Amino acid sequence: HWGYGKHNGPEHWHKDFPIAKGERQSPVDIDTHTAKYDPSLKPLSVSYDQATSLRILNNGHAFNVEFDDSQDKAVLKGGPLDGTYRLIQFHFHWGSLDGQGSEHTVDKKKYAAELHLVHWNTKYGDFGKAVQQPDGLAVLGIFLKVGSAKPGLQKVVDVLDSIKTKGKSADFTNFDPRGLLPESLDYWTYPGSLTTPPLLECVTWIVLKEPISVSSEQVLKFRKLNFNGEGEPEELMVDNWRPAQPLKNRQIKASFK
Numbered sequence: 001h002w003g004y005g006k007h008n009g010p011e012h013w014h015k016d017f018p019i020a021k022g023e024r025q026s027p028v029d030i031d032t033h034t035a036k037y038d039p040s041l042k043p044l045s046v047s048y049d050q051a052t053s054l055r056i057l058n059n060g061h062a063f064n065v066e067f068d069d070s071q072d073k074a075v076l077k078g079g080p081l082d083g084t085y086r087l088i089q090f091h092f093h094w095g096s097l098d099g100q101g102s103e104h105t106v107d108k109k110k111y112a113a114e115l116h117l118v119h120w121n122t123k124y125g126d127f128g129k130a131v132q133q134p135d136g137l138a139v140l141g142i143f144l145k146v147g148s149a150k151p152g153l154q155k156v157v158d159v160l161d162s163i164k165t166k167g168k169s170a171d172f173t174n175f176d177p178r179g180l181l182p183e184s185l186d187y188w189t190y191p192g193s194l195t196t197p198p199l200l201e202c203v204t205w206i207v208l209k210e211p212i213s214v215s216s217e218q219v220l221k222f223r224k225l226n227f228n229g230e231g232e233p234e235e236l237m238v239d240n241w242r243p244a245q246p247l248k249n250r251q252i253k254a255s256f257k
């Protein structure tokens, strides 16, 4: 099955998932000089005050912090979006070294990691129905650079020892995702896809311009996770990112001048 190695990585995904070569695949390079300011875009409304985190899971591809999405609690509205999108989970993609790890790039720059907060459009009732729709999902992407520590990330870092291998989970209640945001909510947006199989073309991407800083020690802990299950040969969970894909007939819009 699919992964990030030589024999099962991004260059192989199209065999099982032919949409890998589709018309609106993600991630992409954001060419900042050609992303046009769109004065009709609205400020992003991030309403996370009532978020209920539940659990953290190593799924063999990343670690997901999962939320109660059975009701309108943590929601994303505004920006390029019509209606209301509920937060279901967040996770990261990261590198083996600080010079790579992000999925999106900015003028070809790769960041050390990228946070994805995944939301689904409540007009479709459940996540599974939302991923059958071209406007089913909204993913808020946030770049990570290595510098000062991010205090709001440390609770995540400190639980990782308990979910080292694929299939392990741990209770993870009362985590506030507001502590992972940068100051500014200025963003770029474009229509795209999931960046892993099944690569479904359901996503309004909202990529924040301002990275967050995390410390070297924080990202080093991400890199001690394992892709493998317990009692299998150890494969460090690093370089779990898909490279940039062809932009094709799309335009990236900026929310800011």
Ligand SMILES: O=C1NC(=O)[C@@H](c2ccccc2)O1
Residues within 6 Å of the ligand: 091, 116, 118, 139, 193, 194, 195, 196, 197, 198
């Ligand atoms: O942007 C994405 N990051 C991923 O891991 C992938 C994704 C796969 C499955 C569910 C939600 C998101 O899409």
Ligand code: NA
Residues within 6 Å of the ligand: 034, 035, 036, 251, 252
């Ligand atoms: Na453009």
Ligand SMILES: [Zn+2]
Residues within 6 Å of the ligand: 091, 092, 093, 116, 195
């Ligand atoms: Zn992701």
